[PDB]
């Protein structure tokens, strides 16, 4: 009975300078142990936010996270070329740790 | 739930976590993580045991808590409050 994570929007197109929000849903309450990762076209992955809203060292303020219970979201402001990537959420509440399918952002 | 096993013998205190058999066990002492690869080599964690060699009452008394890998210290709800002296012929 592992926790299923879902990101209903598989792909999103936006414009430079815009602000977008990516939704993430858990099948059970994950008590804010929700993290966000950014994967670049070359396959490199970086941590962005952990525990729903804490920014990881080196991550710019344009990234913010929110959510509670089963509903979470990542908000990315002032979009730039460097932000073109796939964003993934992951729950860290119960083993086995699980990830959603990601949202590919094109700008 | 089973109680923590508290073994005080000579100058060594050995605590044994109650449950979670088959799981890696982690520890905190007064809200500080211990049992890993830290500077103090008189503190050892093996299986469900935490060994405190040359135990110091002043620095090592206090709250101890164990939890299985996969769990969070913040969620632990069963603590050991240890106040012990390792005096010769304590009896």
């Amino acid at each position, epitope marked *: 009975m592992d926790i299923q994570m879902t990101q209903t929007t598989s792909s999103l197109s936006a414009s430079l300078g815009d602000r977008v929000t990516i939704s993430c849903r858990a099948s059970q309450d994950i008590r804010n142990y929700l993290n966000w990762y950014q994967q670049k076209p070359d*396959g490199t*992955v970086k941590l962005l936010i952990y525990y729903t809203s804490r920014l990881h060292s080196g991550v710019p303020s344009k990234f913010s996270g929110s959510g509670s219970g089963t509903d979470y979201s990542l908000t990315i402001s002032n979009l730039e070329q460097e932000d073109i990537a796939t964003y993934f959420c992951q729950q*860290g509440n119960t083993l086995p740790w699980t990830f959603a*399918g990601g949202t590919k952002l094109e700008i | 739930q089973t109680p923590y096993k508290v073994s005080i013998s000579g100058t060594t205190v050995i605590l044994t976590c109650p449950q979670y058999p088959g799981s890696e066990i982690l520890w905190q002492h007064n809200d500080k993580n211990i049992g*890993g690869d830290e500077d103090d080599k008189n503190i050892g964690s093996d299986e469900d045991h935490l060994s405190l060699k040359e135990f110091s009452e002043l620095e090592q008394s206090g709250y101890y808590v164990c939890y299985p*890998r996969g769990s*969070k210290p913040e969620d632990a709800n069963f603590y050991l409050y240890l106040r012990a002296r390792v005096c010769e012929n304590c009896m």
Partner: nanobody
Amino acid sequence: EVQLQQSGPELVKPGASMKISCKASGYSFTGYTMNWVKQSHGKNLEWMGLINPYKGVSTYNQKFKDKATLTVDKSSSTAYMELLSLTSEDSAVYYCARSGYYGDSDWYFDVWGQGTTLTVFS
């Protein structure tokens, strides 16, 4: 700087086994947990398991316990994952990723290797 450097791509036939590696630099190997993550179809991510480098004790996702064997070599700061009884369904990119040593931070991955592509075919 802090980095996880993984071994190169591997091509293997079904039924074979393959051990891939992950070299840590810029930080104390034994002061953090090492995790392995599988990405198939260039999207779907799955946490396979973790290993405590200091103690050499592993904890697996039941889905991959039969498929993987995790080990570490403390002397060289290298983590290994051996993949067993390979099938084409095991073709994917595998990542090693670091997390905290203790439960206060072992559940989010702060440093990721570049990934190792494994392709199983005949």
